[PDB]
Structures are given as structure tokens and as C-alpha cells.
Design an enzyme around this catalytic site. Sequence first.
Site, PDB file in Angstrom:
ATOM      1  N   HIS A 108       0.837  -1.192   0.000  1.00  0.00           N
ATOM      2  CA  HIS A 108       0.000   0.000   0.000  1.00  0.00           C
ATOM      3  C   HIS A 108       0.874   1.246   0.000  1.00  0.00           C
ATOM      4  O   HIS A 108       1.770   1.374   0.831  1.00  0.00           O
ATOM      5  CB  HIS A 108      -0.940   0.006   1.206  1.00  0.00           C
ATOM      6  CG  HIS A 108      -1.933   1.125   1.188  1.00  0.00           C
ATOM      7  ND1 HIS A 108      -3.022   1.138   0.343  1.00  0.00           N
ATOM      8  CD2 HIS A 108      -1.999   2.272   1.905  1.00  0.00           C
ATOM      9  CE1 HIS A 108      -3.716   2.244   0.542  1.00  0.00           C
ATOM     10  NE2 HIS A 108      -3.118   2.948   1.484  1.00  0.00           N
ATOM     11  N   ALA A 140      -6.118  -8.412   5.832  1.00  0.00           N
ATOM     12  CA  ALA A 140      -7.232  -8.751   6.709  1.00  0.00           C
ATOM     13  C   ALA A 140      -8.547  -8.482   5.987  1.00  0.00           C
ATOM     14  O   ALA A 140      -8.551  -7.938   4.882  1.00  0.00           O
ATOM     15  CB  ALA A 140      -7.154  -7.963   8.006  1.00  0.00           C
TER      16      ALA A 140
HETATM   17  N1  4DW Z   1     -10.565  -7.996   2.286  1.00  0.00           N
HETATM   18  C1  4DW Z   1      -9.560  -7.330   1.539  1.00  0.00           C
HETATM   19  N2  4DW Z   1      -8.685  -6.520   2.155  1.00  0.00           N
HETATM   20  C2  4DW Z   1      -7.734  -5.889   1.452  1.00  0.00           C
HETATM   21  O1  4DW Z   1      -6.944  -5.156   2.025  1.00  0.00           O
HETATM   22  C3  4DW Z   1      -7.659  -6.075   0.080  1.00  0.00           C
HETATM   23  C4  4DW Z   1      -6.835  -5.603  -0.933  1.00  0.00           C
HETATM   24  C5  4DW Z   1      -5.673  -4.645  -0.767  1.00  0.00           C
HETATM   25  C6  4DW Z   1      -5.824  -3.347  -1.533  1.00  0.00           C
HETATM   26  C7  4DW Z   1      -7.175  -2.962  -2.096  1.00  0.00           C
HETATM   27  C8  4DW Z   1      -8.195  -2.684  -1.195  1.00  0.00           C
HETATM   28  C9  4DW Z   1      -9.457  -2.324  -1.652  1.00  0.00           C
HETATM   29  C10 4DW Z   1      -9.673  -2.247  -3.022  1.00  0.00           C
HETATM   30  C11 4DW Z   1     -11.082  -1.848  -3.496  1.00  0.00           C
HETATM   31  O2  4DW Z   1     -11.911  -1.517  -2.674  1.00  0.00           O
HETATM   32  N3  4DW Z   1     -11.365  -1.882  -4.886  1.00  0.00           N
HETATM   33  C12 4DW Z   1     -12.669  -1.519  -5.311  1.00  0.00           C
HETATM   34  C13 4DW Z   1     -12.659  -0.762  -6.623  1.00  0.00           C
HETATM   35  C14 4DW Z   1     -11.561  -1.101  -7.606  1.00  0.00           C
HETATM   36  C15 4DW Z   1     -11.746  -0.689  -9.050  1.00  0.00           C
HETATM   37  O3  4DW Z   1     -12.768  -0.037  -9.388  1.00  0.00           O
HETATM   38  O4  4DW Z   1     -10.878  -1.001  -9.908  1.00  0.00           O
HETATM   39  C16 4DW Z   1     -13.425  -2.817  -5.503  1.00  0.00           C
HETATM   40  O5  4DW Z   1     -13.762  -3.466  -4.477  1.00  0.00           O
HETATM   41  O6  4DW Z   1     -13.705  -3.232  -6.658  1.00  0.00           O
HETATM   42  C17 4DW Z   1      -8.661  -2.522  -3.934  1.00  0.00           C
HETATM   43  C18 4DW Z   1      -7.401  -2.880  -3.466  1.00  0.00           C
HETATM   44  C19 4DW Z   1      -7.266  -6.165  -2.126  1.00  0.00           C
HETATM   45  N4  4DW Z   1      -8.317  -6.950  -1.846  1.00  0.00           N
HETATM   46  C20 4DW Z   1      -8.574  -6.916  -0.531  1.00  0.00           C
HETATM   47  N5  4DW Z   1      -9.506  -7.526   0.212  1.00  0.00           N
HETATM   48  N1  GAR Z   2      -4.010  -1.998  -3.938  1.00  0.00           N
HETATM   49  C1  GAR Z   2      -3.429  -0.822  -3.328  1.00  0.00           C
HETATM   50  C2  GAR Z   2      -2.702   0.013  -4.350  1.00  0.00           C
HETATM   51  O1  GAR Z   2      -2.980   1.192  -4.511  1.00  0.00           O
HETATM   52  N2  GAR Z   2      -1.755  -0.605  -5.046  1.00  0.00           N
HETATM   53  C3  GAR Z   2      -0.802   0.161  -5.819  1.00  0.00           C
HETATM   54  O2  GAR Z   2      -0.855  -0.205  -7.198  1.00  0.00           O
HETATM   55  C4  GAR Z   2       0.453  -0.109  -7.765  1.00  0.00           C
HETATM   56  C5  GAR Z   2       0.724  -1.291  -8.681  1.00  0.00           C
HETATM   57  O3  GAR Z   2       2.009  -1.109  -9.265  1.00  0.00           O
HETATM   58  P1  GAR Z   2       2.565  -2.154 -10.349  1.00  0.00           P
HETATM   59  O4  GAR Z   2       1.338  -2.546 -11.137  1.00  0.00           O
HETATM   60  O5  GAR Z   2       3.582  -1.351 -11.120  1.00  0.00           O
HETATM   61  O6  GAR Z   2       3.156  -3.272  -9.520  1.00  0.00           O
HETATM   62  C6  GAR Z   2       1.449  -0.079  -6.616  1.00  0.00           C
HETATM   63  O7  GAR Z   2       2.226   1.120  -6.674  1.00  0.00           O
HETATM   64  C7  GAR Z   2       0.617  -0.105  -5.351  1.00  0.00           C
HETATM   65  O8  GAR Z   2       1.045   0.906  -4.437  1.00  0.00           O
END
Ligand code: 4DW
Ligand code: GAR
EC number: 6.3.4.13
Length: 200
Positions: A108, A140
Site C-alpha cells: 500500500h 485482513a
Molecule cells: N478484504 C480485503 N482486504 C484488502 O486489504 C484487500 C486488498 C488490498 C488493496 C485494495 C483494497 C481495496 C480495493 C477496493 O476496494 N477496490 C474496489 C474498486 C476497484 C476498481 O474499481 O478497480 C473494488 O472493491 O472493486 C482494492 C485494493 C485487495 N483486496 C482486498 N480484500
Molecule cells: N491496492 C493498493 C494500491 O494502490 N496498489 C498500488 O498499485 C500499484 C501497482 O504497481 P505495479 O502494477 O507497477 O506493480 C502499486 O504502486 C501499489 O502501491
Amino acid sequence: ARVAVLISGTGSNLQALIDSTREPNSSAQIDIVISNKAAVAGLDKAERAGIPTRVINHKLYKNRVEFDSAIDLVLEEFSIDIVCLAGFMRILSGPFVQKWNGKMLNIHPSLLPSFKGSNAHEQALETGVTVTGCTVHFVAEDVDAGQIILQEAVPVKRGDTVATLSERVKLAEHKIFPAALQLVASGTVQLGENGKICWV
Ligand SMILES: Nc1nc(=O)c2c(CCc3ccc(C(=O)N[C@@H](/C=C/C(=O)O)C(=O)O)cc3)c[nH]c2[nH]1
Ligand SMILES: NCC(=O)N[C@@H]1O[C@H](COP(=O)([O-])[O-])[C@@H](O)[C@H]1O
């Protein structure tokens, strides 16, 4: 340790992970790369490296849990021990997160608990901090709220934009995410039964 990397976009973090696993002393091996979107730049990096790729389009499944099951099936197929989220943008369901609890990592682009969410850099610039960074943490059920494994601070320079700031932060991401994966895959760092982070 057998590792799966989940991607949605570019995958520069994927490449850094791949390079660090080629190291003779690496405790991790990347056996499969999974993208929820077809023909993203991460699949080519994985194919150029010689790593099997599987596309599981969530926009072709009944809902979240069903789609998570399709991923889980592939993870079981390749006997995966550890899951790395490298720009994977789908929120994973309760049961999936619980099954892979303490075995799933995420990067992150902020110093958690600061700036949780989809646009950390935008938040950081709006708030006006002079120090930001990146965080590797166990995934988590609550988004960006898992236990913290590694963090690296990155300075914010005056006149910074999302373009320049993310460029600088990503250099730190490429350091601590392979380092964190090694810590977990070697058994050095694990999720404590109390909930917190346990070293050995
Ligand atoms: N339970 C859980 N915890 C997490 O920390 C986590 C993660 C880590 C980072 C993360 C967290 C929320 C969204 C997110 O909310 N994305 C929304 C929109 C993305 C888009 O429009 O491309 C979505 O839910 O689709 C996208 C990425 C991925 N999947 C997860 N699952
Ligand atoms: N899911 C949280 C989030 O914002 N992720 C972000 O997406 C990028 C993917 O980089 P990459 O595609 O060059 O590895 C990363 O910089 C990371 O911080």
C-alpha cells in the site's frame, strides 16, 4: 515457499518480486500469476519470466465468493503457500481472506494507518505531509487494516504530483515488498495467534 501473485494492472512490483526470487538464497518461488483482467501488462512480464498465467475475469461470475473460489481453485492446483497482491484491485470475500489469513501480503502506497484507500498519493498531497511512504501488510478482511510487516518512508518534495510522488514511492515499494515476502516465506515473520506480528 510456493507463491502466487495477484495482479490487475501494470506489475512493476511483480517484476521486483520475480527478480528477488531468482536469488539463490531466496525462500520464495513464484509458481503462478493471476490477473482478474485479460491482457494486462503484468501477464507479459510473467510470461517473459517463464511463469504460468491464469485469467479469472470477475465480470463473468455470479458474485464475489464464487469468483474468489475460482481463484482458490487455481491456488490449490499450484499448491500455493503464500499469496501476494501486486496491484490487485478486487476486494476479497470473508472466507477467502480467512482461509489465506497470515499467508497473504499486500503493498500500500502510504505509511499506514495514514491514507487508507484507493488514492493514497492524492490524499497525501491534499493533506500536505512532507513524509509519506509505503506499507507491506498481511491482508485482513478490513481493507488496509491487516498487521504491518515492513514500511519505508519516502519524502514529499514541493511541487510534487501523483506522477512524481508515486515514482519515488515505487522505488521503496520495490525494496520492502520483496524483502517482506522473504521474511514471510522464510518463516522469520509470521502472524501471531494474538493477532500481532511475530518474529523468530
Ligand atoms: N478484504 C480485503 N482486504 C484488502 O486489504 C484487500 C486488498 C488490498 C488493496 C485494495 C483494497 C481495496 C480495493 C477496493 O476496494 N477496490 C474496489 C474498486 C476497484 C476498481 O474499481 O478497480 C473494488 O472493491 O472493486 C482494492 C485494493 C485487495 N483486496 C482486498 N480484500
Ligand atoms: N491496492 C493498493 C494500491 O494502490 N496498489 C498500488 O498499485 C500499484 C501497482 O504497481 P505495479 O502494477 O507497477 O506493480 C502499486 O504502486 C501499489 O502501491
